[PDB]
Amino acid sequence: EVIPTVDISAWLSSTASPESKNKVVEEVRSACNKYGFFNLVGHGIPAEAREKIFGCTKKFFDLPLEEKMKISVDKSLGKSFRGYEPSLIQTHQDGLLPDTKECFITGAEIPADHPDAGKFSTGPNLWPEGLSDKEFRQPVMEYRALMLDLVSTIVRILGQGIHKAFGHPSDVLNDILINPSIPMRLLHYAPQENPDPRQFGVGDHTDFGCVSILLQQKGTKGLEVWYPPKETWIPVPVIEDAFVINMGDTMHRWTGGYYRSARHRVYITGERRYSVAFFLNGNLNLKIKPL
Ligand SMILES: [Fe+3]
Ligand SMILES: [Y+3]
Structure with a gap:
């Protein structure tokens, strides 16, 4: 068992055949139904953008x-x-022991005096005084925009897999893109030569939201996924020019379990590890209804 890689080039291309585009829907719906994870390529984001966010x-x-x-x-x-x-x-x-993870948390920017400011994970971001907008804030928010765009693509592909599976309109899911709750986390994992096996980078959990998009660092490992059929943890390989995509609990319930939310974690290694995790949650008003 290996986590698959899906190339979405065809779905983003405006000249690809409808067959090529369906093949993308097949590979996605299928990885999300079997593993709840895949690696995604063909997204069109340059390697520069990934370099710049690890710089930040x-x-x-x-x-x-x-x-x-x-x-x-x-x-x-x-x-x-x-x-x-x-x-x-x-x-x-x-x-078990607490997680070695160090993290910085952003969401959509909302002025302090906005009506929804202060509510759960909606409001203004906090920014470090010791960094310039040019070093940190501007790149972070630009990467957020690229992520929002990619996750909107992912959602519509999932919606199309729903259409094929159960016959709904292929825009079943697109209302979560309306004014979305989109936190991102910058992640740091300090390395250890001899780690306690009772401590992880991040312990066994599921993501609560809908879609998560992860950027790993070339030359690191640690991320693994629980696959019930074989009662094993599968590694998620660091693929070149890829993002790791997984489904959350809200997507799980909102489908019939057709898109699976799978347990996953990050064990400790000797190499220093960075990652950028962006998530798409259900809306602050949207009552998510199953099939
Ligand atoms: Fe997670
Ligand atoms: Y104002």
Whole structure:
């Protein structure tokens, strides 16, 4: 068992044959129904954009810890959960140790005086005073835009797989793109030579939202996915020019389980590891209804 790779070039091309485009819908619906994950290529985002966001991520986490804590998540407006979260505080199971993960959290930018500001994960972002807009904020928000565009493509492909499966309009799912809740996290995993097997980078979880898009770093590993049929954890290989796509619980319930939300985690390694995780959640008003 291996996590598959799906090339969406045809679906984004305006000259590809309808056969080529359907083949993309087949490979996607199928990976999401069997593994809940795939690797995605053919997205059209340049290698520069991926280089630039890891530049931002390293600059940020290289900051002094007192410097990051100045925008610690507990300082964000109300229930906007934005800013810096340090390592060794997130836990998953009582027998185990907290996660080595260090993370920085953004969402869609909303002025402080907006009506929804302060509500759950909606409001303004917190930005580090010690970095210039040009070093950090502008690239981060530009990458967010590229991610929003890609996840909108992914959603419409999923909707088309729903059409083929159960006969619904191929825009069943497109209402989550209306004013979406789209957090992203910049992730840092400090390396360890001899790690305790009771501690992970991130422990066994599912994602709660709809779609997640992950950018891993060339030369690292750690991400693995639980596949019930063989009762095994499958590794997710770092593919060149790829994003890792998985389904969340909201998509699970909202389909019949047809798109699976699969358990996954990141074990600790000796190599320093960065990743950028962007997620698409259900809306703040949208009552998500099954089939
Ligand atoms: Fe996750
Ligand atoms: Y205003």
